[PDB]
Symmetry: D2
Subunit: 244 residues, 4 copies
Amino acid sequence: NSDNLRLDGKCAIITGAGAGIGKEIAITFATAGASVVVSDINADAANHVVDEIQQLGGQAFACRCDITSEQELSALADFAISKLGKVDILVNNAGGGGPKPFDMPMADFRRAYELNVFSFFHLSQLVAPEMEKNGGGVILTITSMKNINMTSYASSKAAASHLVRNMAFDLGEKNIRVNGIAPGAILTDALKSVITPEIEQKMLQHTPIRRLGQPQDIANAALFLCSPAASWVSGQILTVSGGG
Amino acid sequence: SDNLRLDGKCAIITGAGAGIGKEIAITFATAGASVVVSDINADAANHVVDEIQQLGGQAFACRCDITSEQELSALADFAISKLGKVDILVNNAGGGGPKPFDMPMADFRRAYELNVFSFFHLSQLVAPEMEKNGGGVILTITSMAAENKNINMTSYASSKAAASHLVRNMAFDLGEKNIRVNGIAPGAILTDALKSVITPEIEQKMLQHTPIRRLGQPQDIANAALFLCSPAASWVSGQILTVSGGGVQEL
Amino acid sequence: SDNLRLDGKCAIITGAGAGIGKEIAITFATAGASVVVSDINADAANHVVDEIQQLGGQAFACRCDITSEQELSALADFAISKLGKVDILVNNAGGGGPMADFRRAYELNVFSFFHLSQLVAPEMEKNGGGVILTITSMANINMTSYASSKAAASHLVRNMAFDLGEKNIRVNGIAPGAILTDALKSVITPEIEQKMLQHTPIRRLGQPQDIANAALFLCSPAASWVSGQILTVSGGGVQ
Amino acid sequence: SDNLRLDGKCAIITGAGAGIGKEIAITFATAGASVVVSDINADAANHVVDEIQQLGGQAFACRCDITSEQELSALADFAISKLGKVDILVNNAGGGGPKPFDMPMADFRRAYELNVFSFFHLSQLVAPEMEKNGGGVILTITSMAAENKNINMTSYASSKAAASHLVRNMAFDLGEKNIRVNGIAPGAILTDALKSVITPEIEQKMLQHTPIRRLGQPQDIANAALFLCSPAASWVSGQILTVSGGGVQELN
């Protein structure tokens, strides 16, 4: 029930684990006893999160990967099985995302689909056979993060969400749970470089649920959903965004 | 491993006599919560309090019809008096199910009394009590009938869809008081009650569109309730988590 | 053309003495329906009958308090006396937007519509089909009562459609946004108004004509395979 | 008469050769619109242009492979040239269907080239032309798969859920230009295509969970398209109307 939120013996791939929400998923899962492949677009960023995990206990390995190359996604899977022996957990991060004008070049609209939909659907194809071997596992996508100037990322987030619901049918036969988190009003790095003394005091006037949560808030929900404690939770999208 | 423990924190669990609310009252108790156990039947409440004290936690029993506003005021008053405060409220008391379109209006209204009017009133009574100790967390057990459509479900589905939506609204309002509000839509739970009923032929039929192909246990739903009412869901509010192995189970 | 006409058909219409009800009443009369015009206030209902009669007869007035089951029932008996059959039912919630208070939203949006549907379906079954329509309340200030009631009523439609479908009766709902002429003046001001225009892509508020149009579509043979739909008429807004 | 006709309007209709998209162009042309009929086969759009012509309506054929951004740019400019304005865009062309989870990635990406990127680039093109007429309406034909939940449906369902959510995003971005954006999720339509495989026994399997016990006609969708693109929907934006008797119709 509190050992249900542990992952000892489990092996996890986390994409976009260099920084932000990905990073705390990787640290939270390692610290919960899982062997973890830390994957980012950026080799250096990957190795920094691994130093942080290794200096906490917990097994971790860095792998650079561009998630918009299939050859690269296969490399990650083949790497994961090479360093870990099996795969029980895939956590897939898109990356913040954020606003975009209607008249954006098509590439800029297509890019969101790689990050949030395509990469996620292919990595899920790469890891399902491994999971099935081991009598099951769990796949989890963290979608991008209020309705104007959002066609690319709101659109790609809704695709990924109904992809979760359907994947759960396809992969439930293999006893693989599929779910997603929609992260919300997160105090991210962006919003740190950009907050002045005068606003940190103005915000403290509001109640904790009316402010911003931390990436550890997404990380805690990710853990629960990928844990024995949620063994009958599938096709869910949990929005983790406080209450205004 | 401490943000999935409720040490100190004081919970009111309604309908905690049997099935889901019993299992939530016990999991909460064993995770450190002091637990007021409410049921329509004093006798069923006492069996669960006894059980929580054999296992080393602290629970008080309190008979309560959630359709009497005065009985709901007395339930809250009892919680403040034996625990000293309220941190958690698990709204499990509910009811109704398949009814024909031509039922009496009395029968249609009972659905709203059980699932809507009761829920809102108890939330509005405990809220001021939760602000004064710096906030709190409200959980309701809703139903998959709130998001599914079928013949003979007018009273039940509509009442539960209202409840599902009170979660979203209340989450906004009670945000100012630092209160979280969520719901759990449970799948088919293989409870003690059902385990009498269920032949191994019905099992096949219920799970025939359930991707994680087994029936639910009360523990599955109590695990979900533990997560949502714990500091690890401090950034989770206005949400309905469905636990049903990714499908629906007909009967 | 006449696939969006109501010639020879007989509509019951509540909340019809002002605002969205009145505009549906007149649209429907104009479309050829005989109309029972019910409002809480018998004066208001009576002016809408006389205005419909000046335009091209076939309207009848019936004071109804929709929160009392006897009043609901007399309006259903009164409606069968004057019209002979019922083909179309349009329930119009009496909710502006902003416990016994909490319950009133459920009387208007939920318990009135269901019970009126219960009285009127036996008549619709008898004549081999029909159509029922709810206008939900225009319903963040004291709207938790109206948003919950609106959500109930909306899923009532989705479910109630299965029940009445066997009887060849289609069920739908319109969930209207911020809509003027009617006594919204009450609280609108110039500040609260402009706060609605910034989150409405189509920069204008609704007229009652916006709903009555949708209402005519959903209640005509043009929408004869539409059931269990809530149509949002919000100029692009979100709820 | 007044609020539900298209006299003086100029429609581009994609996938217009058969089924739902053919009956949208015929009902639109009858409502008084000028109509650019587009299918992937110029012969298809033409047959339909002849059906329209033989009923009093001005129409024109411009073929388009919606998957190519250049034939998309060719269709846009043809309709500008032929009609003068673009007041209305009915997005109907698109494919995909059930495929297994272990599908080639090329099959998965194609569903997006068919059901999303097409819908969006073509909107990117007609939106400015619509702006300088004082507004317009865009309609897309989505799918109940965008809401429904089943096996072997990943490429189709996800992709259709993008098109459907696009609808409420484009409503916000184009409302400034006074453009309305809507969609319809059609039930099982007894098009000629379907009437040629239908058994008076699979009808029964499909009507099972279906409150108004009949399959649709392309007229049911065309009627709906006409409301949503007529000025009787002048204040309807960011909405999906599902037309399917209040049920889901399954081969399952």
